[PDB]
């Protein structure tokens, strides 16, 4: 149950959303969406789980 | 058969009348378009996946929603786009003539071979295949004269009140509401949140 | 010419009328067609002279 | 001639119509926020409600939404014009109106603004021109694409005698923000990794929550930062996250963060990674002519990037490639109504050599008032191998009654019925060809289309009545003395 | 007849809107078709004329010029009946073959 | 009613609204039609009113 | 039925017959939907239904 | 167990609010009430037909389906291309009398 | 809900075919309003509360 | 990792009960076994688009 539970969490996907998105302040003049994508690809990395 | 009716005038006059009445009351009923129906079908298939990247849609739905979508019949060409927002459409345009019902029940049928393979993520969203166009018919905007309503107002009260009854109009494939509805905001503030010891 | 107009009713009785006028039409069309041929050769060999 | 005639023609597919209403759009670069968009869409409402103000009635500028790729950096306009009465002459057409847009709209400096007509079909495309799809076929990857693409745009621009308006149809590579979120780090300061993606998620994109009642309708419910808490990288750290322990722990303290260069919108055109591209036809120059310069630049790209025609190019392609099979089917269907009508072999050929003499005509028409082989043209054509036909039959069919009927001479005969016959030729001939004549002459709303039907069958008329009233006794004589 | 249709809705929705609120249609190609249709109708008619003037040139006599000039309603008619009874419609094709 | 209160008719009663009732011009047709026919076979404009 | 059920019955009892066409209802009924455009709310639409 | 302002507010409502874009839909009317059954009935022009109707409906109802309630995910949304009277009653009788 | 609505849990095999189990309060405990203060709620200590 | 009374009890005979309304349909057939997968299968008239 414990290394379910380890597996579930480590690997998501997060709607991280933009950099100055809409609603914007006034002024603002950089938008870039943020990319925070904590995925394991890999067999080690698999194994390093906590 | 010409001396037959030089014989009888009155036949050919009947027959003449006829075919000219026919052919009044047929205009009577029949449509008037600029052109028949000339392009080819299009189908649409959209899957979001919330939080990916482009190149994350490209490799994750959309190479696996098109690799089972070749095969179907009268298919003329494919293309598909990954937005960095998590959508992917993938468009299909078939032969002219094909029906275009039968075409949307079998990608439909593709889709559902196709479907298990993508992310649950995709899945839990709802992926739809509907008949797909490419330029507007008509743009209908609202203003407010007197200057009272910004934006806001103006598109919740459209989405509220014009968008669904148009949006069951005999005929209309689709409908795009260029504002937004009204929503529940909650603007949150970090320093307070952390003031208090809260997090989202 | 009779029969035939009453096929082009509208609406929703517009089939009602139409089943009328398809079936009394090709009972006409196939009465005439009866008479014109089988009929006569009816005629010429039943009917005993009188 | 009739050959070098229709050898040199350009093709097209459909042309393009006056419809009173014509787009625009905005692409502002990479990274482009929604006030700078907004800031160039004001621009362009400005000079189409001052510089156009007798033609442009309206305009419905909508900011960060595009035809193809959404985004705060891009942004259309549907600019109506006025009523066509109210536009006189060439110079107030959406033609000149957009050719003059153009000129002020290449100047910008701080984006790509394009306005360009609507298509013919305009359920096939979102603008006149051609669609190209640049495919990379050998696997090269993104990076090499919009390499070729670029290398692609410098070939074009070597060539604005043909090709004008050549823009992308997608988005460019953006900036994008990458989060690191050191697991480990949370792990120790005991922060829980759902804790750190919902905080995150809901702090700078929103979250949507559930729903509420608003004046009876089901409406969304959404959470999301505050402005000014949402706008820089510094932001990051401002955001904290409750761990185990039950103390606040910044983002700064378990993440890092650095810049990529993304594709924010990848495309794929039949299975392989492709980039779209739009364009145009000089004024004066055919869409064929541009398809084929295209097709020839993208000849001289690296190897492994293909290219293929979609939409109204497609469509254009296809009705290039099978109209030698229509002409010939046609010809053949003729030929044999002939044989069967007439019962003979000769007749039919004797016929069939009338209809070069009204396509030449047909293609002098189209070469002298500067059209195109469009799809009406072609049909046009049909109608001059029919007319041709058939004043060859108002001629041959009478001559070969009097050689069987009377018994005349070869030469009698045909001199007989060119003299008789020559009146209802004339008067046929001149009905069809006024008949045509408002098409010809035509200059409204539909004046493209109609120009194309009648401007290429009426001179065809002219042909095969001046030249088929000499040459057809010539045609019948020669066949019937070879018998063949 | 969408745009017909859309038409009549707004028509409906009109009342019930709140003070100040107006429709306006920054764009729409309906227009288009509509005049499009009525010019190659105008064309076809001129048509007509002119091929009457043009027999009248060559039979000089206005009952001979009569009996061909009737071969135009009936034929055109029929041909409406006939594009009724197949499925087609009147676009601006049909009457480029009517005009032809 | 007051201000805000629409209505709409279903069912049947929206099924009647949608039908026209083109009876009188049908049969007006149809008489016309006959009429045509009668002459045809007479030779005459005038006998088919008998 | 309608008159023994009617007299006596407390509830409203409504004995009927299913006409020819079951969609085609009563020749003179009719269905009027009252619809509250304007959001007013339930108890506002039962106001203006009185 | 919900009552009909609960069936309209959580079900009604968001199957109503995606169900658009369905070809030749006449009229659209639901129904919720107290036993908490939601009743949505899509009526469509005559001669439409009905497998492709009920596709698209289908496939509407879809989209909107997540968005529901758990509870009455499990309990089984139903989609059928009836009629709405009886065909016929099917009653069975123990006479024996035994059973319930 | 379980107790005045009933709530379906799971499902179960009899005789064969899957058929569904329901959990509700006996029909006297949920008859009348003052019903309402027999159901106790188990608090985080361990203590039933009304 | 179920076996053929679980696969049965748990999805074909709930998949076999929610399969009404599906038009020309002559006989359905379906089994579970060791490995756990449950195969339904159901055969249409000849006629039928499939």
């Given at each position: 149950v414990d290394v379910i539970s380890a597996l579930k969490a480590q690997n998501a996907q997060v709607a991280a959303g933009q950099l100055g998105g809409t609603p914007p302040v006034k002024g603002q003049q950089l938008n870039a969406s943020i990319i925070a994508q904590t995925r394991l690809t890999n067999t080690e990395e698999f194994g390093n789980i906590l | 058969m010409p001396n037959f009716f030089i014989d009888r005038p009155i036949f050919a006059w009947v027959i003449a009348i006829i075919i000219m009445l026919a052919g009044g009351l047929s205009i009577l009923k029949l449509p008037v378009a600029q052109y028949p129906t000339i392009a080819p079908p299009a189908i649409s298939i959209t899957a979001m996946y919330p939080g990916a990247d482009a190149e994350t849609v490209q490799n994750t739905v959309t190479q696996v929603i098109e690799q089972n979508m070749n095969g179907i019949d009268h298919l003329m060409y494919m293309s598909s786009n990954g937005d960095s927002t998590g959508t992917a459409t993938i468009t299909l345009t078939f032969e002219s003539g094909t029906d275009p019902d039968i075409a949307q029940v079998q990608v439909q049928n593709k889709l559902a071979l196709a479907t298990p393979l993508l992310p649950q993520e995709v899945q839990q969203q709802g992926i739809s295949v509907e008949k797909a166009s490419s330029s507007f018919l008509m743009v209908v905007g609202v203003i407010n004269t007197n200057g009272t309503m910004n934006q806001d107002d103006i598109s919740d009260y459209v989405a509220a009140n014009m968008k669904d009854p148009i949006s069951r109009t005999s005929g209309v494939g689709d409908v795009q509401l260029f504002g937004s509805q009204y929503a529940m905001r909650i603007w949150m503030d970090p320093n307070k949140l952390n003031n208090f010891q809260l997090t989202p | 010419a009779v029969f035939i107009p009453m096929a082009f009713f509208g609406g929703s009785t517009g089939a009602i009328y139409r089943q009328f006028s398809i079936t009394i039409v090709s009972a006409m069309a196939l009465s005439v067609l009866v008479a014109l041929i089988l009929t006569p050769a009816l005629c010429a060999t039943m009917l005993k002279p009188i | 001639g009739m050959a070098w005639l229709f050898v040199r023609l350009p093709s097209s597919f459909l042309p393009d119509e006056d419809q009173g209403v014509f787009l625009s759009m905005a692409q502002l670069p990479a990274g482009a926020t929604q006030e700078r968009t907004?800031?160039?869409?004001?621009?362009?409402?400005?000079?189409?409600?001052?510089?156009?103000?007798?033609?442009?009635?309206?305009?419905?500028?909508?900011?960060?939404?595009?035809?193809?790729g959404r985004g705060q950096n891009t942004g259309i306009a549907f600019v109506s014009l006025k009523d066509w009465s109210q536009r006189p002459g060439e110079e107030n057409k959406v033609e000149a109106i957009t050719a003059r847009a153009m000129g002020y709209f290449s100047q910008i400096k701080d984006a790509m603004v394009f306005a360009f007509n609507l298509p013919a079909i305009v359920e096939l495309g979102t603008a006149t021109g051609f669609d190209f799809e640049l495919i990379d076929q050998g696997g090269l990857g993104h990076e090499k694409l919009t390499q070729a693409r670029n290398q692609l745009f410098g070939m074009v621009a070597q060539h604005p005698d043909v090709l004008t308006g050549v823009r992308p149809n997608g988005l460019e590579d953006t900036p994008q923000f990458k989060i690191d979120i050191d697991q480990e780090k949370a792990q120790a300061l005991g922060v829980s990794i759902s804790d750190i993606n919902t905080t995150l998620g809901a702090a700078w994109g929103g979250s949507y929550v559930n729903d509420f009642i608003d004046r009876g309708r089901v409406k969304k419910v959404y959470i999301m930062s505050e402005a000014k808490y949402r706008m820089l990288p510094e932001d990051i750290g401002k955001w904290y996250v409750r761990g185990s322990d039950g103390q606040m722990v910044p983002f700064s303290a378990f993440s890092t963060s650095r810049?990529?260069?993304?594709?924010?919108?990848?495309?794929?055109?039949?299975?392989?990674?492709?980039?779209?591209?739009?364009?145009?036809?000089?004024?004066?120059?055919?869409?064929?002519?541009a398809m084929a310069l295209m097709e020839e630049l993208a000849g001289k790209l690296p190897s492994g990037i293909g290219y293929d025609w979609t939409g109204m190019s497609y469509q254009e392609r296809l009705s290039g490639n099978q109209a030698p099979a229509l002409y010939a089917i046609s010809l053949i269907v003729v030929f044999l109504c002939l044989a069967a009508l007439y019962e003979s072999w000769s007749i039919p050929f004797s016929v069939m050599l009338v209809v070069p003499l009204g396509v030449v005509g047909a293609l002098l028409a189209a070469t002298f008032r500067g059209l195109t082989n469009?799809?009406?043209?072609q049909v046009g054509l049909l109608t001059t191998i029919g007319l041709s036909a058939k004043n060859a039959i108002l001629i041959v069919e009478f001559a070969k009654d009097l050689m069987e009927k009377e018994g005349k001479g070869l030469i009698e005969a045909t001199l007989e019925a060119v003299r008789m016959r020559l009146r209802p030729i004339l008067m046929t001939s001149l009905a069809f060809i006024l008949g045509v004549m408002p098409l010809v002459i035509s200059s409204g709303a539909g004046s493209g289309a109609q120009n194309a039907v009648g401007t290429g069958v009426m001179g065809g008329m002219?042909?095969?009545?001046?030249?088929?009233?000499?040459?057809?006794?010539?045609?019948?004589?020669?066949?019937?003395?070879?018998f063949s | 007849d969408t745009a017909n249709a859309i038409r009549a809705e707004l028509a409906k929705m009109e009342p019930f809107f709140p003070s100040g609120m107006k429709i306006v249609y920054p764009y729409d190609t309906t227009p288009f078709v509509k005049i499009s249709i009525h010019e190659v109708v105008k064309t076809l008619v001129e048509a007509i004329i002119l091929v009457f003037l043009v027999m009248y040139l060559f039979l000089q006599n206005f009952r001979a010029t009569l009996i061909p000039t009737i071969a135009v309603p009936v034929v055109l008619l029929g041909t409406f009946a006939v594009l009724a009874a197949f499925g087609f419609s009147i676009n601006t094709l049909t009457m480029f073959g009517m005009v032809l």
């Open positions: - | - | - | 907004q800031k160039v869409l004001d621009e362009m409402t400005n000079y189409y409600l001052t510089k156009e103000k007798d033609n442009v009635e309206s305009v419905f500028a909508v900011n960060g939404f595009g035809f193809a810049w990529e260069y993304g594709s924010p919108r990848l495309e794929r055109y039949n299975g392989l990674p492709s980039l779209e591209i739009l364009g145009q036809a000089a004024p004066g120059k055919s869409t064929g002519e469009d799809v009406y043209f002219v042909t095969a009545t001046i030249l088929a009233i000499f040459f057809v006794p010539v045609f019948f004589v020669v066949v019937r003395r070879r | -």
